[PDB]
């Protein structure tokens, strides 16, 4: 059962790492979508680069 | 911030790409978190065993 | 222990019902929030009911 | 679609409450998930018993 703990701790580390990286890149992408639809939700049509 | 120029002239399509990412965010974190949590309980069992 | 199993099965059912109901209800809330933050993220202020 | 006439004059407060309800989604789904699986593990202890 101690060997099982070790592999379990390895697997926990893999999921914690994977979830940390995944949530960081995906949250940065989600935050990018929020910046786009908050700062420029077709507001570029009011600007129109005139 | 993301991309270097990356079609900023008309960026509407990218929001749709980011939506697929946002859906997959929830799936990927919900499953991952549940897996580690399942093993946290199993660890406690193994600990209790 | 069979009494415990019976009550536990009732409780499993309650958790399944609750987890389903909340995931659906909040997913429809997410779908409604995403339509608001897509179509009218402060666009109502650009309009200003002028 | 949601509501019939739903505070169209100033709706940002609803976006904030719906975000709070998405936090409630994450809390409720994780709590229900860990608790149901932990009580399922209690069921396994009971089954072995």
From TrEMBL, chains A, C:
Query: Where, subcellularly, is it found?
Result: Cytoplasm, Nucleoid
Q: What is known of its domains?
A: The hinge domain, which separates the large intramolecular coiled coil regions, allows the homodimerization, forming a V-shaped homodimer.
Q: What this chain does, per the record? A: Plays a central role in chromosome condensation, segregation and cell cycle progression. Functions as a homodimer, which is essential for chromosome partition. Involved in negative DNA supercoiling in vivo, and by this means organize and compact chromosomes. May achieve or facilitate chromosome segregation by condensation DNA from both sides of a centrally located replisome during cell division.
Assembly and partners are described as: Homodimerization via its hinge domain. Binds to DNA via its C-terminal region. Interacts, and probably forms a ternary complex, with MukE and MukF via its C-terminal region. The complex formation is stimulated by calcium or magnesium. Interacts with tubulin-related protein FtsZ.
Would you identify the family this protein belongs to, as annotated?
Answer: Belongs to the SMC family. MukB subfamily.
Record-given protein name: Chromosome partition protein MukB
Gene name tied to this protein: mukB
